């Protein structure tokens, strides 16, 4: 089976100033992540602006990552949505261009019931023979997949884990305790990921690791090895980054950060906007403090 563990950046989608895809920058970013110690990548998730890419651009981003990664690390493709048929079709594309798994968000906006969430994910897992990592982020979807629903889906073949973005460490302990052995609990909340991992979770699917891949890889490695002192020392150093990369909605700040670091151009697609001028010095100070600028 595919083994996804440790630091997994939700990597941005680099764009030219006019919003077109910047595949040259994307390839360089992938090589940089691999040499810095990144364990896997989630491609065209929320941080990758999946909302504003066409189907052709979405699949091209996955294929580009798969081809360039060249099996050095696993590539997980964001492929979910609030339509079960659309998520099935995107998952078929991700499989066809060689993704190792899909990341599947709980439906946003249309507020399905718990049973609707179960049937949605179960239909996706059954329709496409490729592993599924669930993604619960009620702060964006409104609908909230309960632990009970999550653990029902852990019994469905193909569903290998969940990205929990709640930052609710009680809920994470409940999932870790009750989860079957094959089922991985990943943080989706950089400020609390260290705790989720110290309690027995399996990794962090991360915004901060976009700009600090080596530090985040070391933090995950230590937290998963039950080494509190090493993990918390790194975490405390990144604390201002964990905060200020959300000064506006992710990925607005992290894309401006990577532009300041010289790794991408400024493109970002409406309705997202370039980081507000008023926020620049705050993010700049966090990057300079982290030694990134």
């Amino acid at each position: 089976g595919i083994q996804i563990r440790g630091s997994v950046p939700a990597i941005v989608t680099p764009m030219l100033e006019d919003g077109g895809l910047d595949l040259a920058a994307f390839r360089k970013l992938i090589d940089w992540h691999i040499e810095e110690g990144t364990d896997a990548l989630v491609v065209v998730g929320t941080s990758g602006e999946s909302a504003t890419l066409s189907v052709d651009e979405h699949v091209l981003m996955i294929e580009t990552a798969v081809k360039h990664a060249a099996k050095r690390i696993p590539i997980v493709a964001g492929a979910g949505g609030n339509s079960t048929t659309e998520a099935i079709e995107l998952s078929k594309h991700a499989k066809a261009v060689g993704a190792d798994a899909t990341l599947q968000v709980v439906p946003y906006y249309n507020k399905p019931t718990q049973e609707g969430i179960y049937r949605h994910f179960k239909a996706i897992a059954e329709a496409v023979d490729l592993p599924v990592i669930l993604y619960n982020v009620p702060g964006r979807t409104v609908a909230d997949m309960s632990n009970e629903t999550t653990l029902r889906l852990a019994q469905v073949p193909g569903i290998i884990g969940v990205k929990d973005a709640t930052g609710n460490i009680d809920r994470a302990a409940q999932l870790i305790k009750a989860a079957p052995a094959h089922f991985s609990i990943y943080s989706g909340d950089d400020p609390t990921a260290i705790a989720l991992m110290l309690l027995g979770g399996h990794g962090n699917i991360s915004v901060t690791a976009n700009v600090a891949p080596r530090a985040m890889s070391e933090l995950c490695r230590a937290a998963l090895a039950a080494d509190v002192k090493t993990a918390r020392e790194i975490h405390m150093k990144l604390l201002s980054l964990h905060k200020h990369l959300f000064i506006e909605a992710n990925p607005i700040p992290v894309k401006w950060a990577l532009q300041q670091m010289g790794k991408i151009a400024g493109g970002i697609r409406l309705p997202l906007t370039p980081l507000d001028e008023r926020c620049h010095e705050t993010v700049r100070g966090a990057l300079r403090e982290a030694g990134l600028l």
Copy 2:
């Protein structure tokens, strides 16, 4: 310009057992609405399951509604989303098959800034020469278009109003007081719509009106004529319906209700699900009490 005022059901999308469209039932529903006093329809809005229709199905629903209405009432097409370029394409399609305006939801899931929301809607109004009604529903989108942003967009040519689903009656009065003369304020919250209209708003884009179009047309007529006593007597009779049509996420309950009334079949598309059996007694009781069953 087009006059949209009064009771405006957000009409369901009738489907057959596999979710396929049921245009014959839809045309009959439109005729019933016109006979019962409905003032305009919003087609393939949230209540119409826009999230799970293909672009072609979306356009076919609008075209069917425009043709069948035969200019007897205005047809407002839901055509928004969280991608600015996609909303522009859908708005083009809506204009091309004869919609009188589009209903444009604030982007869900990707959490744009206020300036992102402003730029998103302005781009949509400028790209397609057809009126726009904005739609703020933070209970589904998370992003919340502030009154300040709304009133800025009221200065943009083509933006003729807003559907305010917050149920926040302070916010409604603030919009009513400050809105320019050309800019209509509609309720998107059936339980509070009577108050929004009595304070000077212009109509109610409604779930309850799917099943009680005559009563809701009379409620809006009275509230807009400052006739409290008539409006509140109708409102109180419908009070349980306003509640139990949301016992599960709209449009799950109202589609079940219209099926019990013999007006549509049971189709509904995942991730939405047929109304939970545990809710049937309660919803039918509200229908029967309101003289609809």
Copy 3:
């Protein structure tokens, strides 16, 4: 029984510079309220800083208000809290100095169950032969008395109504529709009170009426007579005041406002503080705009 209807300011407790009571200013305020059309007063409620008065000061304020009013208007004494035995003692004291009713807040901080809330208020009504008006303000208490619990208490002898500060206009209509004939529904939310009264409620226990008692008495009079047009014209004029009197926690802004109007001195008791200097311009602007300054 006593008739409490219309505009009922939750009157501030005037204090001198060290927080000591200022009964001379208080008596002058009561006379001004009566001249301006105020219908009744709630004395040493939340707006009266009940939290920081001694029992003796609490009782002296009630006694002063009863004596000075001289039966021209009813005096409702705040006498509740989160201890059932303490609320009984305060209610005894209020009856003994001639209050016409007590205002009884849902227990704050200790988060009783619905049955705890029921038993608390029932014990208070039974212990002291004086009418009780319940007071639900979950924005301050956290505990929220459900409509079901409220309507159960409406069956208890002596419990004559409820002050509903939620601003939830659906909840208000539900209470109005189900309330027995003897049981009054009052607003506790100045921004939405007009809607609660137009739907059939009975009055507004008000912060804004501290500074605009004549306008608020006319607003309530019109709303209770189903005169939308008159009520809403007054409401819109006061809309900014309804907002900026809460720019900091009530009663911080309204005490500063009454001082600017020359009606009280600046005393206010810790942990409350004089209105922040950064808010002065905004609050005075609302006062001046409303013709109060």
Copy 4:
């Protein structure tokens, strides 16, 4: 200086069936805690029903604990409230009967500003020469003492720590990182306390430790020694207890639990109520699973 560290039960106030104080049971409970490994006790805090005790009963509870503890462990007296003068007077009593410190809640109900919260605590610390531990529990107080305000008060002589009941592990890391060396961060949230301590905090002021003092003492000892494996194994065993002791508002379930364990009688004071019958089997199963029944 007094050194408060590790497992600190917020001990219940045992009552006879009629609600009178049960000092004999209280003394036995104190001896049981000391032999089971409890490090300190908070007496007549929220869990001790401070809301419904008289001043005489409040001070008698502190004195009883101080006398019986006989300096074997530190005794911290709850002594705060939403009136600065009342908190000063209660703190004087706590000092006079030999408490080692007071625990001071942020004002509930009257919603002070951040500056009002600062001045409240600063006035308490200055008025009574005894250490102060701050207590932030916005889930009960509504007012929320920001980290910035907390760290300002860390500079005031006498203020030696804060009990943070938010369960917000991001906020706890921020406080731990920025706190002066003399200033202790205690959890007030049993489900997350392990994480707060592993990140560098200093103890857990606990509900669960009322029924599992030895386990909680071992968990705190291990978490403070950076021993993740030992701490998390204990934590996972107590997970159902951490949850179900809040099935109704603390201290309703923990007092019923201790009655089932034979350590106290059933008394509890309105508006709190004995644990709902419907909850008994759930709490009983959690206690039997923890080996306590």
